[PDB]
Design a protein around this ligand. Structure first.
Ligand SMILES: Nc1ncnc2c1ncn2[C@@H]1O[C@H](CSCC[C@H](N)C(=O)O)[C@@H](O)[C@H]1O
Length: 326
C-alpha cells in the first residue's frame, strides 16, 4: 500500500508509504506530495496547464491522495509523449530557482532528519551548541557575496549540511565543503547528502561539486585547507572566545580577497590600527555588518546579524607607510 510520483525527467519514481508520515507539527508527507506537484508544475508550463483542469484534496483519505497522484502521473506521461513529438523537452543541467530549492531542501531535511529532537542533545555552554542558519540568510549571503568558479566555499561546523547544499545548488564554486565534529549531525549529514543527490536527480536539476565531511576544523589538516579557502561560512555565535581565537590564527593565513561570513565578528567594526594592536587580526580585514532581512528578530529581540570579513592587508601596509611620514 503506497503512493507514487513520477519524475519529470524519468528518474525513479518517489514512493511514499501509507499511512503518510508526519515530520513535525508543521510538516507532513501529504503536504510534501502536494507541494512537490506544485513545484514540478512551475518547472513545466505544459504540466501546469494540464493540472488546472484541480479538485478537493483531504490529505486524510488514501483514495483521494491516490487520486491526486494519478492525475499528476497521467499528466507526466502525456508531457513525456509531447517531448517525443516536436516540443522541446525541459532543459536539463539548470540550477533550481530559489523557490524550488527551498522546497527541495525542506524535503531533503524531512526525509533525513528522522528525529529532529536528537540535534538538541549537545553539551550546553560548549562549542557543540547546535543552531541552524535559515534558508533566507543563506540566500542573502549567496546574493551579496557573489561567487565564481574560482571560489572554494567552506562551512566550518556544517551541522546536518544544509548551508552547503543550498550554496552548492545556487553557485558554481569549484568545490563546497562542510566539516562537522559532532556525531549526531554528522550522521544525519550522510543521509542529507544521499537524499539531496537523489531529489536533485528527481527534479532534473544540477548542483556544483560538494563534500560533507566528519572532522575537527581545528585539526592540523584543516590549517592549510582554511588557508586555501576563498569563502568561509561559520556560525560561530556559540563557539566562545577560545575557539574564536584559534579560528583567527587560521584566518591570518588566508589570501587577499578571502572572505568570512559569520554570526559573530572576528574583529571590531570600528578597528583603529595602532602601536598596541599591531598583531590583532583586525589589522588585515575589513569587517561589515550584512543588512538585516526586514522583520527578522533574534532571541534577543534585536535583528539577527551576520558579518562579512574581507582579507585586506592594505590596512597594514598603509599604517607602516604612515610611520615613514610626519
Ligand atoms: N572544532 C569543530 N569542528 C567541527 N565542527 C564544530 C567544531 N566546533 C563546533 N562545531 C560545530 O559547529 C556547529 C554549529 S551550528 C551551525 C550549523 C550550520 N553550519 C548552520 O549554520 O546552520 C555545531 O554542529 C558544532 O558541533
Amino acid at each position: 500500500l503506497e503512493l507514487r510520483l513520477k519524475s519529470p525527467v524519468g528518474a525513479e519514481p518517489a514512493v511514499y508509504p501509507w499511512p503518510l508520515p508526519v515530520y513535525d507539527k508543521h510538516h507532513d508527507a501529504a503536504h510534501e506530495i502536494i507541494e512537490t506537484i506544485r513545484w514540478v508544475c512551475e518547472e513545466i508550463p505544459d504540466l501546469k496547464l494540464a493540472m488546472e483542469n484541480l479538485i478537493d484534496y483531504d490529505t486524510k483519505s488514501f483514495e483521494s491522495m491516490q487520486r491526486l497522484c494519478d492525475k499528476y502521473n497521467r499528466a507526466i506521461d502525456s508531457i513525456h509523449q509531447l517531448w517525443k513529438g516536436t516540443t522541446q523537452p525541459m532543459k536539463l543541467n539548470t540550477r533550481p530557482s530559489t523557490g524550488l530549492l527551498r522546497h527541495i531542501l525542506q524535503q531533503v531535511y524531512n526525509h533525513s532528519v528522522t528525529d529532529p529532537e536528537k540535534l538538541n542533545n549537545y553539551e550546553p555552554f560548549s562549542p557543540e551548541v547546535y543552531g541552524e542558519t535559515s534558508f533566507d540568510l543563506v540566500a542573502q549571503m549567496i546574493d551579496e557575496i557573489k561567487m565564481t568558479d574560482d571560489d572554494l566555499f567552506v562551512d566550518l561546523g556544517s551541522g546536518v549540511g544544509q548551508v552547503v547544499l543550498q550554496v552548492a545548488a545556487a553557485t558554481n564554486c569549484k568545490h563546497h565543503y562542510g566539516v562537522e565534529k559532532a556525531d549526531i549531525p554528522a550522521k544525519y549529514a550522510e543521509t542529507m547528502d544521499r537524499e539531496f543527490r537523489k531529489w536533485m536527480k528527481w527534479y532534473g536539476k544540477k548542483h556544483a561539486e560538494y563534500t560533507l565531511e566528519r572532522g575537527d576544523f581545528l585539526s592540523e589538516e584543516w590549517r592549510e585547507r582554511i588557508a586555501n579557502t576563498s569563502v568561509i561560512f561559520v556560525n560561530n555565535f556559540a563557539f566562545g572566545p577560545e575557539v574564536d581565537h584559534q579560528l583567527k590564527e587560521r584566518f591570518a593565513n588566508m589570501k587577499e580577497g578571502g572572505r568570512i561570513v559569520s554570526s559573530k565578528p572576528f574583529a571590531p567594526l570600528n578597528f583603529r590600527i595602532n602601536s598596541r594592536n599591531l598583531s590583532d587580526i583586525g589589522t588585515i580585514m575589513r569587517v561589515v555588518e550584512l543588512s538585516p532581512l526586514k522583520g527578522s528578530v533574534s532571541w534577543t529581540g534585536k535583528p539577527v546579524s551576520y558579518y562579512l570579513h574581507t582579507i585586506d592587508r592594505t590596512i597594514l601596509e598603509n599604517y607602516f607607510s604612515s610611520l615613514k611620514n610626519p
